[PDB]
């Protein structure tokens, strides 16, 4: 039926390594966001998407309604105790924002309001709370708020004795701050006024003019993120400096005045470490001796005196650790499973936390007090809604503290499996899938295959309430744990980045082909979805294996890879040479160009596709998906659906942000379910 929008072609040559690429849609990039022709193309595409998807309005209403109907009792958090006060977060129906309350630990009956986001948001266009922490003496509240939607945080201070606010505001911060043990001095991170990268640590005295703040540290390499931490012992504030590959920590005495940063271990390329301090020792998670990390104990900074607690192991990735009175607890990955292990400081007794599920995730939860035998940990699986457990590290007593509530849901209606796929290079790739039992018939069900596959980020198997909208309409939902993710540890990541990035796309295709061959789904009704670096996945896979998928959802997709990675004026580019490579080197130009989806669009049949972008935010700049759709409309030889949906909003936040998230999922799922009919 309808004629889609046709972006004007303005041939723009880019020559690198003597190779000229002609980009007809280079002009859709407008950093200033004013070009009226660029806006007219984005708006034209939105109007086309609106028109093409109009008949799906009734289904979108049905999905949105059943998705919101799964949630509510609006929400109260599990209380935690920190420094003799109990804290709870409360969401009431008819409140856009959380209210944070507290009470003395020995009190039951009465709760004091700490901060009411609904009150803070009054007469504002936007509100995001980026951090909250009461001073050690329980008298002052530090808050990091964004009222402007640019992820620049204002820090303010409330006197809890009379609910008065101090006069000063700390502006353009990362929201990262720590209290000195005097409850009078805070350290915070200032962002660069141009790049907005966190780069400076300041000391502030609460109540005083931020003009008087002292510059403590400034980072020279803006590939290194500046964060603040405080040790379990409260003895040190840490300046944590880190790039994607390299760390450095500086220590600030949290007890004494006029502290200056004390070097821990000087930065060394490909040495990532993090520290804590407790029981008069430094504890260090470090890859100095192996990619899967080890845990060390030290009395001093000197790397040479670091004692091995847990050696790096090829078969086990060490992700993190928590320190308690009698126990070390570590979070690890082995054989495609997350695992928790505890080791007694005195006896060396080792215990594993046991589960019984093929496709779950477990993690260390919030544990703000170390003088306890009670560990809080999280659990989720494809069939079991997210749960918070409390485990007695000594007795092994395991108690549920909170379960995600899911209305209209019977868990025994669903089944899940772990599947291992031998990839084309003979490497075993894990897969996690779930489906509704009573509608399952081998070879007949639509498949939805979800992947990410970058940065060592894992698509860990966990519960989704929205996913029930597909499962209850006969879909088999698949997580493909492809290389470039972290499911099999650091080497799984490294075997899907830089000169191995093609393994990410190959693994996704290999998993999909295997599941169809094995009878998990209908070969004619295979769908896929991914976002951001998962959108790069979508883009590469449809160029390489266009007949495999019926339909695709590509969210905010990274697709103009070579052109973006040649231009440091784009946010992210200078931080992403250690992910994709630096195409200013011919070896990386050639390797990336081979999969760069925008470059590799060809005159061939593609699947149906819905593409999303956002004008006023980004992460991937809005122009990449818009150029990509323009080029696909020019070249593709099929008559299938191709739609671009651009988020025009000034921004979101609070329950209306959750409203928007459900609307978007309902629009994407209606698109897919319409194709599966």
UniProtKB/TrEMBL annotation:
One of its GO terms (biological process) is proteolysis. GO terms for molecular function: serine-type endopeptidase activity. InterPro entries: AB_hydrolase_fold, Pept_S9A_N, Peptidase_S9_cat, Peptidase_S9A, Serine_Peptidase_S9A. Keywords: Hydrolase, Protease, Serine protease. Residues 462-674 form the Peptidase S9 prolyl oligopeptidase catalytic domain. Residues 5-404 form the Peptidase S9A N-terminal domain. It comes from the Bacteria. Belongs to the peptidase S9A family. This is Oligopeptidase B. The lineage of its organism: Bacteria, Pseudomonadati, Pseudomonadota, Gammaproteobacteria, Enterobacterales.
């Amino acid at each position: 039926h309808m004629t889609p929008p046709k972006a004007e072609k303005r041939p723009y040559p880019i020559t690198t390594h003597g190779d000229t690429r002609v980009d007809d849609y280079y002009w859709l990039r407008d950093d200033e966001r004013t070009d009226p022709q660029v806006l007219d193309y984005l708006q034209a595409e939105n109007a086309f998407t609106d028109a093409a998807l109009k008949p799906q309005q009734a289904l979108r209403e049905t999905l949105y309604e059943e998705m919101v109907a799964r949630e509510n009792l609006y929400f109260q958090s599990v209380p935690y105790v920190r420094h003799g006060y109990r804290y709870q977060t409360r969401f009431e129906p008819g409140n856009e924002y959380a209210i944070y309350v507290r009470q003395p630990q020995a009190e039951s009956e009465h709760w004091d309001t700490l901060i009411d986001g609904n009150q803070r948001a009054e007469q504002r266009e936007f509100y995001t709370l980026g951090g909250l922490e009461v001073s050690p003496d329980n008298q002052k509240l530090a808050v990091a708020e964004d009222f402007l939607s640019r992820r620049q945080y204002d820090i303010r201070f409330k006197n809890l004795s009379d609910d008065s606010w101090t006069d000063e505001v700390l502006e353009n911060t990362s929201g990262s701050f720590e209290w000195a043990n005097d409850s009078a001095t805070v350290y915070y991170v200032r962002k660069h006024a141009k790049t907005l990268l966190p780069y400076q640590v300041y000391r502030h005295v609460v109540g005083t003019d931020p003009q008087l703040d002292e510059l403590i540290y400034e980072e020279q390499d803006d590939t290194f993120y500046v964060g603040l931490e405080k040790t379990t012992s409260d003895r040190f504030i840490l300046i944590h400096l880190s790039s994607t590959t390299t760390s450095e920590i500086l220590l600030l005495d949290a007890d004494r005045a006029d502290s200056t940063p004390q070097m821990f271990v000087p930065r060394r390329k490909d040495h990532e470490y993090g520290i804590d301090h407790y029981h008069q020792h430094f504890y260090i998670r470090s890859n100095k001796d192996g990619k899967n990390f080890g845990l060390y104990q030290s009395e001093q900074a000197d790397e040479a005196q670091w004692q091995t607690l847990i050696a790096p192991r090829i078969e086990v990735m060490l992700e993190g650790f928590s320190l308690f009175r009698d126990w070390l607890v570590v979070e690890e990955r082995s054989e495609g499973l997350t695992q928790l292990r505890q080791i007694h400081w005195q006896s060396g007794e080792v215990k594993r936390i046991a589960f019984d599920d093929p496709t779950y995730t477990t993690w260390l939860a919030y544990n703000p007090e170390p003088e306890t035998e009670l560990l809080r940990y999280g659990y989720s699986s494809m069939t079991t809604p997210t749960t918070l457990y409390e485990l007695n590290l000594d007795s092994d007593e395991r108690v549920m503290l909170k379960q995600q509530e899911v209305k209209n849901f019977t868990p025994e209606n669903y089944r899940s499996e772990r599947v291992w796929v031998k990839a084309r290079d003979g490497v075993e790739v894990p897969v996690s899938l779930v489906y509704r039992h009573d509608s399952f018939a081998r070879g007949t069900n639509p498949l939805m295959v979800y992947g990410y596959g970058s940065y060592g980020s894992s698509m860990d198997p966990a519960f989704s309430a929205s996913r029930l909208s597909l499962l209850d309409r006969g879909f088999v939902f698949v997580l493909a744990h492809i290389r470039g993710g972290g499911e099999l540890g650091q080497l799984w990541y490294e075997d899907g980045k830089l000169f191995k990035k093609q393994n990410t796309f190959n693994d996704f295709i290999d998993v999909t082909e295997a599941l169809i061959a094995q009878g998990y789904g209908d070969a004619k009704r295979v769908f896929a979805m991914g976002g951001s670096a998962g959108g790069l996945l979508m883009g590469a896979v449809i160029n390489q294996a266009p007949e495999l998928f019926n339909g695709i959802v590509a969210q905010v997709p990274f697709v103009d890879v070579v052109t973006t990675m040649l231009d440091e004026s784009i946010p992210l580019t200078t931080g992403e040479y250690d992910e994709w490579g630096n195409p200013n080197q011919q070896a990386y130009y050639d390797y990336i160009l081979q999969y760069s989806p925008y470059d590799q669009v060809k005159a061939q049949d593609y699947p149906h596709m819905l593409v999303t972008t956002g004008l006023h935010d980004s992460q991937v700049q809005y122009w990449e998906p818009a150029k990509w759709v323009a080029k696909l409309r020019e070249l593709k030889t099929d008559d299938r659906q191709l739609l671009l949906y651009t988020d025009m909003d000034s921004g979101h936040g609070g329950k209306s942000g959750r409203f928007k998230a459900y609307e978007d999922i309902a629009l994407e799922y209606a698109f897919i379910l319409a194709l599966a009919e």
